[PDB]
Swiss-Prot record, chains A, B:
Membrane-spanning segments: none
Record's function text: Metalloproteinase with a rather broad substrate specificity that can degrade fibronectin, laminin, gelatins of type I, III, IV, and V; collagens III, IV, X, and IX, and cartilage proteoglycans. Activates different molecules including growth factors, plasminogen or other matrix metalloproteinases such as MMP9. Once released into the extracellular matrix (ECM), the inactive pro-enzyme is activated by the plasmin cascade signaling pathway. Also acts intracellularly.
Recorded domain comment: The conserved cysteine present in the cysteine-switch motif binds the catalytic zinc ion, thus inhibiting the enzyme. The dissociation of the cysteine from the zinc ion upon the activation-peptide release activates the enzyme.
Residues where Ca(2+) 2 binds: D56, G88, N90, D92
Organism listed in the record: Homo sapiens (Human)
Full-protein residues shown: 103 to 269 of 477
Family designation: Belongs to the peptidase M10A family.
Name of protein: Stromelysin-1
Length: 167, 167
């Protein structure tokens, strides 16, 4: 499609419109926070929070129909979805609350999905690499700590904003 | 990113918002109806034009910044672009008037481009295959009234809507 969806800006906001039941809000703010950070660490993109008003990336929690062309389908199949850079609905990320969000590995871990969604919200498509973050099918890490941006994710995203240096 | 990006209804609507100085208005209307037919003949879908109100596929001619994340670039480079099915901007098609739209093949034939574009509006993607309607690089083609779909495009479209009811 004519033009790689990418922020022509470097300083981006987000607004966590609401929170899931499955976790303590402070657990959700973190996930959302580290997830943003994995992209801050490998590029010059910087992100600020909004507690009102339309933000680039509006994060939220939904179920079934919820305002956009892609309803959720209950437990399983789709876990979330995000939209590439642009005005309005673009940049956004929605998580299906019919999935169980976790800080750990009990099932669907928020940090991990969130982190993949921001890839999309930044301009990343899926990768065909079994080890990468933008791979289309979710996979859980017995140990959250050994978590890293496969160098497949890093280039991909850098090919869009470049290395950290601050552009 | 995730989720089958097709219209869920077969009866899609469309509107020509405005025209190009380049060619008579009936030219443009006709290049557009054929564009639509190129896809009627190979699927179930049906189109009906509107002369007011918001339509699925909003068709218009523009230049440079014109209401979306992707302003046009002047003569050459990009000629048009269109959006997958869904709400608002989704489904619309836009034509860079910095280009010179022609009935024949002296310049950039409205029909061929319109044909490619509707395809996007319908959910199709660009091609790797080189003899198809979706290959990213445009090319003039005489005889027009005897235009045909490649199998790639054919396979592209039916993967989404199937064969025309039509036995
Ligand atoms: C519980 O998982 C599921 O039921 C099913 N769904 C998915 O994974 C669907 N994919 C989706 O719902 C979306 C499309 S944007 N991707 C979310 C997602 C989130 C995280 C990772 C991930 C990748 C590598 C390491 C760690 C995590 C991968 C994908 C199936 C895999 C069976
Ligand atoms: C370098 O490519 C080019 O020369 C041309 N530029 C492009 O093609 C760039 N493309 C674009 O703006 C859009 C992307 S959405 N491509 C529209 C398009 C329309 C019709 C066909 C086509 C294919 C096969 C047979 C007949 C026609 C192919 C592409 C023109 C500037 C002359
Ligand atoms: Ca947004
Ligand atoms: Ca689901
Ligand atoms: Ca839940
Ligand atoms: Ca142009
Ligand atoms: Ca539309
Ligand atoms: Ca023109
Ligand atoms: Zn959604
Ligand atoms: Zn994804
Ligand atoms: Zn446009
Ligand atoms: Zn195209």
């Amino acid at each position: 499609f004519p033009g790689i969806p990418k922020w022509r800006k470097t300083h981006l906001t987000y607004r966590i419109v609401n929170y899931t039941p499955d976790l303590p809000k402070d657990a959700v703010d973190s996930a959302v926070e580290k997830a943003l950070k994995v992209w801050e660490e490998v590029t010059p993109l910087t992100f600020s929070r909004l507690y009102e008003g339309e933000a680039d990336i509006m994060i939220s929690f939904a179920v079934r129909e919820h305002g956009d062309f892609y309803p959720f389908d209950g437990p399983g199949n789709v876990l979330a979805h995000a939209y590439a850079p642009g005005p309005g609905i673009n940049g956004d990320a929605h998580f299906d609350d019919d999935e169980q969000w976790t800080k750990d590995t009990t099932g669907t871990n928020l940090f991990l999905v969130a982190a993949h969604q921001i890839g999309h919200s930044l301009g990343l498509f899926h990768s065909a690499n079994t080890e990468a973050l933008m791979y289309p099918l979710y996979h859980s890490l017995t140990d959250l700590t050994r978590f890293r941006l496969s160098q497949d994710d890093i280039n991909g995203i850098q090919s869009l904003y470049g290395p950290p240096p601050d552009p």
